[PDB]
Amino acid sequence: LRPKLSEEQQRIIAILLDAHHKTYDPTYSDFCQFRPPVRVNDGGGSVTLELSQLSMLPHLADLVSYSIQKVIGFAKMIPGFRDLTSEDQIVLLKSSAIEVIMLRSNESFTMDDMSWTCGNQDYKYRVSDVTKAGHSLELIEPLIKFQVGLKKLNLHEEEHVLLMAICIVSPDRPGVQDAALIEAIQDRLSNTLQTYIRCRHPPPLLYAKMIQKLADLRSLNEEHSKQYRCLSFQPECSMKLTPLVLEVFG
Ligand SMILES: CCC(CC)(c1ccc(/C=C/C(O)(C(F)(F)F)C(F)(F)F)c(C)c1)c1ccc(OC[C@@H](O)CCC(=O)O)c(C)c1
């Protein structure tokens, strides 16, 4: 059975598409405002040297901080998000931050060379740049696998925006108070996505593959938090981060 998208569901898709267009800049025109990328010689992938310099940390912390501001902006426009208490809105935003960043970064990701290309060579990021910000292979290698797997789903913008919205509005986050309200908003989004796939995505299991990407994001989020914990033990690391990054990941 292929039920047609309701007027409410079409409205939700239009709102989410407009939300994304207002919060995502595909020209990466603000990148020159971040602290500059610094790429020291590190062919060996030396942990000692990486922690000593953290050369890419001010630039990547600014990029993530910027991306979180856009995610906050996006989330505010999700149908129903504003019906939640401000305590739940912040729990949802904090717990999902790195996952939604991983999803939205897929738009700039390219399988041509397995990089995140955000304009010129200065804003072209690879595995070696994430290690230069103090992260390790236990995070970057499944992260690249996730980017390729997600890129290969060839999501329509409609599916991409619904996936981000479903990620954010998740009832199974620690500290939520009204799980039932969060679940009702998420189901409204999940049903819109299933119906959209069935009636708009041409052949050649896409909904189940998208839900699997959400479970993959959970493991990546746990690895990132463990790595952020280690990176934060580096003396004077806080000056290389941002107040927003410190609060979200602290
Ligand atoms: C460079 C690769 C990557 C990939 C997800 C990234 C970058 C940083 C970090 C960690 C950083 C940290 O742990 C710190 F401490 F190492 F900095 C912390 F999370 F704490 F910040 C990780 C783990 C991965 C990245 C690439 C492009 C990105 O965006 C392109 C476009 O989406 C932007 C405009 C918009 O989203 O509206 C973003 C947002 C991130």
Q: How far apart are CA 98 and CA 93, in angstroms?
A: 9
Burial bucket for residue 126 (CB in 10 Å: 0-12, 13-18, 19+): middle
Smallest Cα–Cα separation from 74: which of 192, 160, 180? 160
Nearest protein CA to atom 30 of ligand 1, as residue: 105
C-alpha of residue 60 to centroid of ligand 1, in Å: 6
Beta bridge partners of 124: 117
Smallest Cα–Cα separation from 165: which of 104, 105, 247, 244? 104
Residue 248, amino acid = V
H or E stretch including 6? Answer: none
3-state secondary structure of 121: helix
Q: Is 57 in the pocket of ligand 1 (CB under 6 A)?
A: yes
How many Cα neighbours within 13 Å face the side chain of 207? 13
Looking up tokens 């912040």 gives 90
Smallest Cα–Cα separation from 221: which of 187, 183, 173, 151? 173
Q: What is the resolution of this structure in A?
A: 1.9
Q: Is 132 in the pocket of ligand 1 (CB under 6 A)?
A: no
Other CB atoms closer than 10 Å to residue 138's CB: what's the count? Answer: 11
CB 35 within 8 A of CB 64: no
Q: CA-based diameter of the chain, in Å?
A: 59
Assign residue 154 a region (left: φ > 0; alpha: ψ between -120 and 50; beta: otherwise): left
Q: What total number of domains does the chain contain?
A: 1
How are strands ordered across the β-sheet holding 115-117?
109-110, 115-117, 124-125
Could you tell me the end-to-end alpha-carbon distance of the chain, in angstroms, rounded to an integer?
Answer: 47
Experimental method for this entry?
X-ray
- Which CATH number belongs to the domain containing residue 232 in this structure? 1.10.565.10
Host domain of residue 77 = 1-250
Q: Is 60 in the pocket of ligand 1 (CB under 6 A)?
A: yes
